[PDB]
Amino acid sequence: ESYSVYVYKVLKQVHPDTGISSKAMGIMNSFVNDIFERIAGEASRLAHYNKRSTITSREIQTAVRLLLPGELAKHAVSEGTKAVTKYTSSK
Amino acid sequence: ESYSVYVYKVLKQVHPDTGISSKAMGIMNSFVNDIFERIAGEASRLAHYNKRSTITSREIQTAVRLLLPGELAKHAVSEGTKAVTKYTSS
Amino acid sequence: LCPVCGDKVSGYHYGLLTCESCKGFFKRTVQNNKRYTCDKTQRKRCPYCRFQKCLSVGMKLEAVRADRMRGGRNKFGPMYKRDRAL
Amino acid sequence: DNIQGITKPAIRRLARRGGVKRISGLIYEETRGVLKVFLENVIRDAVTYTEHAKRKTVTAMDVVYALKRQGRTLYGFGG
Amino acid sequence: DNIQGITKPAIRRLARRGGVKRISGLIYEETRGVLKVFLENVIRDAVTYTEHAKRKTVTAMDVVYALKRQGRTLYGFG
Amino acid sequence: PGTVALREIRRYQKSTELLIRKLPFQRLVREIAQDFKTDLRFQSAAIGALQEASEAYLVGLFEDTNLCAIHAKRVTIMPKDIQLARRIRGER
Amino acid sequence: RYRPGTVALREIRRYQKSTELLIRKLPFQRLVREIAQDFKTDLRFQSAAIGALQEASEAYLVGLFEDTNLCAIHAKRVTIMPKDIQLARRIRGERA
Amino acid sequence: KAKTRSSRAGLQFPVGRVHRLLRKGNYSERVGAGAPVYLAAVLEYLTAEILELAGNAARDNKKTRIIPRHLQLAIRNDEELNKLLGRVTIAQGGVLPNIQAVLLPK
Amino acid sequence: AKTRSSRAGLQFPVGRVHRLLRKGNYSERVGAGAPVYLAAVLEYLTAEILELAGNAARDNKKTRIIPRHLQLAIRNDEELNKLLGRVTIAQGGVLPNI
DNA sequence: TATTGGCCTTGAACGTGCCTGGAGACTAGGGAGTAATCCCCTTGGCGGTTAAAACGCGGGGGACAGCGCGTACGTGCGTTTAAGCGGTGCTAGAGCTGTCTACGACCAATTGAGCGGCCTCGGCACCGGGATTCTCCA
DNA sequence: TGGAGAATCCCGGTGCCGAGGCCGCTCAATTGGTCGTAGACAGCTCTAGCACCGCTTAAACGCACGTACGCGCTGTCCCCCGCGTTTTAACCGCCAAGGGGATTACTCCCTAGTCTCCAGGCACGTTCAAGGCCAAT
Ligand SMILES: [Zn+2]
């Protein structure tokens, strides 16, 4: 499994007329996997510290705050909260 | 939940006429917890790499070889193998 | 009575029954590494006689702590307790 | 302006523990800045941990986790 | 032996990419030694990973995991 | 002008006690913490751990700075040595 | 004739604009195999493993050379010496 | 009638795949209904930022495809991304052109 | 022998290590030999550190291990220095060098 | 008077109660262990360029040592400053228990989104080639 | 400031190999209902964090002073740099033979799950010998 389709969709969203090479997709797949592993590990540690058996959007928010720099963490928190609210609004 | 009893027994085995203080006991507890976490995490990663759903003595041995330096790794592997053999013998 | 001098013992001090006077004298002598030049009435007559009698009765030197750590119990704790069982 | 509570003799003592024989006169401000930068980065993560679990008092384990996150594992304060 | 395959011009090029302008005459032996130590550590970890998996062929994944274990995460090889 | 410095180095490398007054450090810690959140509260153990970590970090940094100073044919440490030590250490 | 130091700067500018490997491949493969011989006999290597090892080694050496250059500049010099490498590796924490 | 969770959340990254990865990754006994949405949104945001910077870097060199060097330039020229990706080496990435001022001719 | 440590000849709790492995989200299943191996490794490491600390405390005329002795034992051993190189010890000080 | 004593502080070793987590036993189901087969994929030869490593050697710029000089840093003493150690008073908020509901695991149909294979053509690398600008000296 | 003269850039031509756009199908994402418990929520007990206050004394601060250390300058000799011949082994293309990695039926032992019994481990309160401090001497 890979993230090539989603990365290409995002690239077409940000840069309409711009392609990419295979090695660049390999690097981006490695980047996505690395960030996923970091955030998931931090969320698991946060859940274990507080003696809870569930990982919620709260643990994701706290892990994003812990792992990312200032402006990046702020923007990521805003985007994730907006996505969660939009998802919950529909059913 | 702490390791004070077991660390005290180990100390009595090593130095039968030497005591330990409270802060040293806390440091030892932190050390044991840190080493446990490191080895367990390495074993979990090893099990995940090979698409295995179980953690066995092989993963623990490989993690010990990966983490500890040369002579420490050799002696730790020897002690663990001896313990596992004795337990299996029953 | 305290075998070192002959006064009333106060308890377990560096090996066995001794009094507060002899306990204090031993701890000062050991901690200060004091050296001098040579009965209850004569207990203050000469440091040498009392000191040599204290070492002679068997009361021990290593019971004193070089770093002077406070509290706890020393290696002779099990022995002290066994002797105190009587 | 409580950073000046880290007096010059204290910085000199810290340097002496590090084996420093001679100290310049411009060291102290730099040391104060470095200490402030370190403390900010530790305290931020400590407070972030404290906000989780809806607590108003910062615990020792919060600062222990904050230190361990930065590769500065500390022994003797629980955990 | 094979270490002399790491020639003086190769180390010169590596230093040139690093911004070094003037190089002494005893640099190359030090570079060979440090490269041997680094390669020894990485290859030891990779071979341990290969051995645990019941294999006789070293893959790229073993090298990547070994590099990650040293805090030298590498991108582009999976 | 070298004897007292050597004596101080010996005593403070054998000393193993803390080297900063506790009340000013407490005030500084609370002042820094007030920025991120208001009406915060602290345990004593947290402040002790913060102080000990800070002292250990500063001692290590000073050791590296002394090494960098010695490399440059000097015995007096300067801010440039601290900056070089932190740069090679990777701190930003 | 170019004065000493012009060609060095030319090479510095040229080799920082490229991304190719700077070590010949066959001697590096031979060295890797010889080093791995002491760990297990009769080993096989995928091409990707050797490529990754080479990439990591070149990156590590370039970083070490940058640190060595900084150390040499600190001591009011232009020429790098082994002692600069030792100091950089000591401060980094690699050498004990 | 069936709708994808990404469409409900308005994302491009998959929510079901992230949920499956979280479940199989041995992170928690249970996974909430909103955690994959948050994680996917964060990953999409980071990928979009990196792609924007890399595309600008590629456009600088008059190219229309992104290669590893453009990724390295974009990552190393941004302070926050550089701090995030500090101990990461990019294959075929190279280094930034940087020469010390003293080494220049007088 | 009822306790698993008695069977394994150890002074560390096999059952507690097994429970911590199970309730730590490491793997879905845990083998019967992993806790024994892990407990043996931990016991060996603790015994090594304690022996070094006791020797350090017995060099000087002391009779109780304080954190300074642990720091001296770890700093003066090449293997343990590499194992615990990024660890700060409470009230340990530094090595009397330089 | 620098030495006797008497009372007071102290930190690991000991007892005691009780409860929660380890030990034993049994069963069901799936994860790990072996074979057999298939076919990439890794190793090993051979011969013709030809680019890269090796070599010689003159000289110029930089490493290194010696010496002089000015001021910044160390040292000591008198005098402020405030840290350190108690005692007392007063809550904010940590820490645990109970109820009960809202949410997430689990299973079975059902459907469509995403990997594999296969043309194809357009971005990008390579060659002249004159144009233009970095170095060097005299 | 001007003149050779190497290193470098701005220009088309060209063709080739990989980026990028379809198809078919299978396999993983979606729906819907039922159910058991994780976690939200409210309320109450009691630790412990934060305020003041007085007195004692060790650290902090100030100041005069003089010598050791940093830094600039000068000379000389080692030794790396730039360039022009020989020598060598790295690349490239082809090829062929296994060696080992990947996939699949299959079967059997290993580990999760539940229930019951009870002792190991934690929380205390209480030694208690040894170091510490004081006045009379
Ligand atoms: Zn007596």
Numbering used by the authors:
A (entry chain D): 35 to 125
B (entry chain H): 35 to 124
C (entry chain K): 85 to 122, 131 to 178
D (entry chain B): 24 to 102
E (entry chain F): 23 to 100
F (entry chain A): 43 to 134
G (entry chain E): 40 to 135
H (entry chain C): 13 to 118
Give the original sentences from the paper that presented this experimental model.
Nr5a2 is a key pioneer factor that regulates zygotic genome activation in totipotent embryos, pluripotency in embryonic stem cells and metabolism in adult tissues, but the mechanism of its pioneer activity remains poorly understood. The DBD consists of two modules of Cys4-type zinc fingers, a carboxy-terminal extension (CTE) and a fushitarazu-factor 1 (Ftz-F1) domain. Unlike many other nuclear receptors, Nr5a2 binds as a monomer to its DNA motif, TCAAGG(C/T)CA, on naked DNA and nucleosomes. The nucleosome structure is stabilized by minor groove anchors, which are electrostatic interactions between arginine residues of histones and the DNA minor groove.
The structure of the human NR5A2–nucleosome complexSHL+5.5 was determined at a resolution of 2.58 Å. The structure showed an extra density on the nucleosomal DNA that could be fitted well with the crystal structure of the NR5A2 DBD–DNA complex. The other regions, including the LBD, were not visible, presumably because of the flexible nature of the hinge region. A prominent feature of the NR5A2–nucleosome complexSHL+5.5 is a reorientation of the DNA by ~50° compared with the DNA path on the canonical nucleosome, demonstrating that NR5A2 binding leads to 'unwrapping' of DNA from the histones. By contrast, the structure of the NR5A2–nucleosome complexSHL+5.5 shows that the minor groove is occupied by the RGGR motif of the CTE loop, suggesting that the minor groove anchor by H2A is outcompeted by NR5A2’s RGGR motif. The cryo-EM structure of the NR5A2–nucleosome complexSHL+5.5 showed that the TCA extension DNA region, located at the 5′ end of the TCAAGG(C/T)CA motif, is recognized by the CTE loop. The NR5A2–nucleosome structure shows that the zinc finger domain binds to the major groove and recognizes the AGGCCA sequence on the nucleosomal DNA. The NR5A2–nucleosome complex showed that the side chain of H2A Lys75 (loop 2) was flipped and formed a new hydrogen bond with H2A His82. This flip was potentially due to a steric hindrance between H2A Lys75 and NR5A2 Asp159, because these residues collide in a superimposed model of the NR5A2-bound complex on a canonical nucleosome.
